[PDB]
């Protein structure tokens, strides 16, 4: 009551709140001023990245548990620390000259690997942070570049307008969907053009989301420690994708005549501090 402050040019302003609701006040609009390599050992499967390589820690935050301060569940059964933390390796996509790009959808891309698809198949809720590590074996005469990006909530538009999308075309089971350098003509598939990144945004503007570059000159691999990002604290993993990887080569790979032409790319994700709630004797499928 009877407050006095400053304004952006003595000069002041005395505004009072005449209402009994916090959402009825005005807007605030004022500020009060042979060699050494590191080895991540998580679960029982290690990696070897580099000594000199940076590791991007998500949106600044490390993946952590959901404390009692911000829980809305009723009862909380156990979360495993060894059983689902291993560096699970997915299928190896093959990089060629005219390769467009690849994507994944990770809450529905680990359903077969280990017990991570054997805990979320029973419990109703779910929460896990991820530690993606994508690698390609380099050489000094194999120029080319790569961009990885973990876009969260990557709503993808359908190929034909006034249609929805189908779950068989949005995600795949073990394979990464290609990113046609042209336009898909499908009636129910996804609009998978590469210069719009599926969501309709400019594909150069995918650098806000945690991103790393796998430039074949000065980098061999890339590791993004993505945190669990969702509005609700807990949501089911079978009808919701938390984020989406996108591996789009900005510069095509150009080898020479007497050089290898079967350069692979693997992804080696690992769920960190995976929590579950609501055990129901379901056994989903």
């Amino acid at each position: 009551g009877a407050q006095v402050s400053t304004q952006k040019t003595t000069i002041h302003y005395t505004n009072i709140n005449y209402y009994k609701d916090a959402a009825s006040n005005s807007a605030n609009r004022q500020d009060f001023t042979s060699d050494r390599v590191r080895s991540i050992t998580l679960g029982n499967s290690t990696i070897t990245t580099q000594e000199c390589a940076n590791v991007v820690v998500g949106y600044g935050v490390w993946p952590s548990y959901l404390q009692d301060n911000e829980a809305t569940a009723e009862d909380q059964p156990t979360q495993p620390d060894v059983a689902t933390c291993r560096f699970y390796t997915l299928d190896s996509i093959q990089w060629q000259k005219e390769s467009d790009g690849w994507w994944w959808k990770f809450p529905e891309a680990l359903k077969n690997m280990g017990l991570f698809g054997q805990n979320m198949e029973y419990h109703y809720l779910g929460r896990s942070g991820y530690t993606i590590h994508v690698q390609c074996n380099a050489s000094k005469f194999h120029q080319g570049c790569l961009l990885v990006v973990c876009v969260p909530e990557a709503e993808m538009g359908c190929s034909d307008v006034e249609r929805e999308v189908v779950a068989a075309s949005l995600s795949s089971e073990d394979t990464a969907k290609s990113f046609s350098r042209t336009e898909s003509n499908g009636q129910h598939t996804v609009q998978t053009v590469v210069y719009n990144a599926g969501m309709g945004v400019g594909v150069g503007n995918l650098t806000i989301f945690p991103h790393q570059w796998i430039n074949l000159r000065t980098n061999n691999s890339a590791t993004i420690v993505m945190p669990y990002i969702n509005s609700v604290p807990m949501d089911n993993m079978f009808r919701h994708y938390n984020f989406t990887l996108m591996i789009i080569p900005f510069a095509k790979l150009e080898y020479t005549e007497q050089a290898s032409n079967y350069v692979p790319i693997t992804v080696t994700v690992a769920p960190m501090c995976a929590e579950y709630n609501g055990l129901r004797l379901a056994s989903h499928q």
Binding site: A23, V151, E153, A167, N196
Partner: protein
């Protein structure tokens, strides 16, 4: 370096009232759907506000809704000759409430609903609504289906459950026929914005999903090293 940012804040970028809907409803007997005008509460109808919201993934704000209700006179015969002022009634319907089938219905009492009666020739009617959702944030993008067996609708059209604003006239208008147009304005305040994301390059085509046509990146210039014009456009 003494050029700090004040009008680049998350408040002043989003504390500006944008028009969200354009309704039209008459005041005559016959065709009872023309008497009232319903609207499910989206922000996805008008583009000018939609692009400002779809820079951030989640949001949380309190809002200030305003209505500039203006009316005309319909042509033909049997016109008013003289006409008193005509008042409008704006009723919010919560998710899961009974809606009126037509005007002069039984359900226009609005005992629980926050109706508001507005007279013409006055200031536009104004109300404040808080952060009203079951979730912790107004999610602008929901990459997930409705049902656990992966059917139903897909996209943001599952957590947009905000009910409808149903507007009507509350005068009988015994002589004449006259329409009126409703223009809803949303001005979110106390805004917090999480997880920024790029602007939509392609034009909008729908208010149900993120459908789009594959557009070019930018416009075309002449060459790789085109500097535009070296002298003015004359000579």
């Amino acid at each position: 370096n003494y050029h700090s940012r004040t009008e680049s804040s998350i408040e002043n970028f989003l504390c500006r009232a944008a028009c969200v809907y354009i309704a039209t409803y008459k005041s005559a007997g016959g065709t009872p759907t023309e008497r009232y005008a319903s609207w499910r509460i989206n922000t996805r109808q008008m583009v000018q506000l939609r692009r400002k919201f779809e820079l951030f993934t989640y949001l949380r704000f309190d809002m200030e809704i305003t209505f500039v209700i203006t009316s005309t006179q319909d042509p033909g015969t049997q016109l008013a000759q003289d006409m008193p002022v005509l008042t409008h009634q704006i009723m919010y319907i919560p998710p899961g409430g009974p809606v009126p089938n037509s005007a002069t219905d039984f359900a226009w009492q609005s005992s629980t609903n926050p109706s508001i009666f507005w007279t013409e020739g006055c200031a536009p009617a104004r109300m404040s609504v808080p952060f009203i959702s079951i979730g912790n944030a107004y999610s602008n993008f929901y990459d997930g289906w409705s049902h656990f067996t992966q059917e139903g609708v897909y996209g943001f059209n599952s957590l947009n459950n905000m009910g409808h604003i149903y507007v009507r006239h509350v005068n009988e208008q015994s002589l004449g026929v006259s329409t009126s147009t409703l223009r809803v304005y949303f001005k979110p305040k106390h805004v917090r914005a999480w997880v920024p994301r790029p602007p939509r390059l392609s034009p909008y085509v729908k208010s149900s999903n993120v459908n789009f046509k594959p557009t070019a990146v930018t416009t075309e210039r002449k060459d790789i090293n085109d500097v535009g014009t070296l002298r003015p456009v004359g000579y």
